Amino acid sequence: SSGENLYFQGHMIDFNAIKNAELLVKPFKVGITTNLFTDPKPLFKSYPNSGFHNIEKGKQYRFSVREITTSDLENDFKNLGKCWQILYQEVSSVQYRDAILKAIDLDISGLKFKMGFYKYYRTGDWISPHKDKPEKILNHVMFFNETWNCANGGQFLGLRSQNMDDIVFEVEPLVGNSVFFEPRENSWHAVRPLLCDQPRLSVQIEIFRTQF
Ligand SMILES: O=C(O)CCC(=O)C(=O)O
Ligand SMILES: [Fe+3]
Numbered sequence: 001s002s003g004e005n006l007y008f009q010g011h012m013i014d015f016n017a018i019k020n021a022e023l024l025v026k027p028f029k030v031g032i033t034t035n036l037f038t039d040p041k042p043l044f045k046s047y048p049n050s051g052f053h054n055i056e057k058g059k060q061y062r063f064s065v066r067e068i069t070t071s072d073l074e075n076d077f078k079n080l081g082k083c084w085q086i087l088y089q090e091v092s093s094v095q096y097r098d099a100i101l102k103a104i105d106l107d108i109s110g111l112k113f114k115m116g117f118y119k120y121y122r123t124g125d126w127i128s129p130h131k132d133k134p135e136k137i138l139n140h141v142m143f144f145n146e147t148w149n150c151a152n153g154g155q156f157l158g159l160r161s162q163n164m165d166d167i168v169f170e171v172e173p174l175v176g177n178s179v180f181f182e183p184r185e186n187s188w189h190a191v192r193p194l195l196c197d198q199p200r201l202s203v204q205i206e207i208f209r210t211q212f
Pocket of ligand 2: 130131132189
C-alpha cells in the first residue's frame with residue numbers, strides 16, 4: 001500500500017522528460033521522450049471523440065484531425081476535457097520554451113503555434129515519407145494510447161531517405177512517448193499504415209514564424 005502522504009506533481013508535463021530526452025544527431029537532430037506525462041492513465045479516455053474531419057491525399061496520407069481553434073480559446077475550452085486546456089497552457093508557457101532550449105539548443109520565444117488532435121483509426125490510415133514543410137520551425141508529436149499492439153502498424157518511422165523501407169528508428173504510439181524535431185532537408189519520417197481499425201491517438205504542436 002502507498003503511503004499516507006503527499007506526492008509531487010508540478011505540471012501535467014514532466015519537463016525533465018524533454019530536457020533529458022533521447023537525442024539523435026544522425027540521420028537528423030530529433031528528440032524522443034519517455035514518460036512525458038506525470039499522470040498518463042486518464043488521458044486516453046479524455047481524448048476527444050467528436051469534431052474531427054477526415055483528410056487524405058492519394059506526399060500521401062489518410063487520417064482525421066480536430067484542430068484547437070479560436071472558438072476553444074473564447075469559450076474557455078468548454079467542448080474539451082480540462083486536461084487539454086492545461087496542455088495548451090503548458091505548451092504556451094516559459095517552462096516549455098526553456099525545456100526545448102535545453103534539449104536541442106533552439107529558442108522558440110516569440111514564435112507562433114498550431115495545436116491539433118490527430119487520429120488514425122481505419123485500416124490503411126498512414127502518412128508517406130516526407131520531411132515537413134520548411135515553414136515549420138519545430139514539430140512535436142505526442143502520443144496518448146494506453147495500449148498498442150505493435151503488429152497493428154502505426155509506428156512513427158524515422159527514415160534515411162524518402163523510402164518506407166529505409167528505416168533508422170521507430171517509436172511506438174504509447175502515452176509518454178513523443179518526438180520533436182526541426183524540419184530540415186533530410187528530416188524524413190512516416191507512419192507505418194494501420195493493419196486494422198484501432199484508434200491511434202496523438203497531438204501535434206507545429207511551431208512557426210510564417211503562417212501556412
Ligand atoms: O503521427 C505521427 O506519428 C507523425 C505525423 C506527421 O509527420 C505529420 O502529420 O506531418
Ligand atoms: Fe510530419
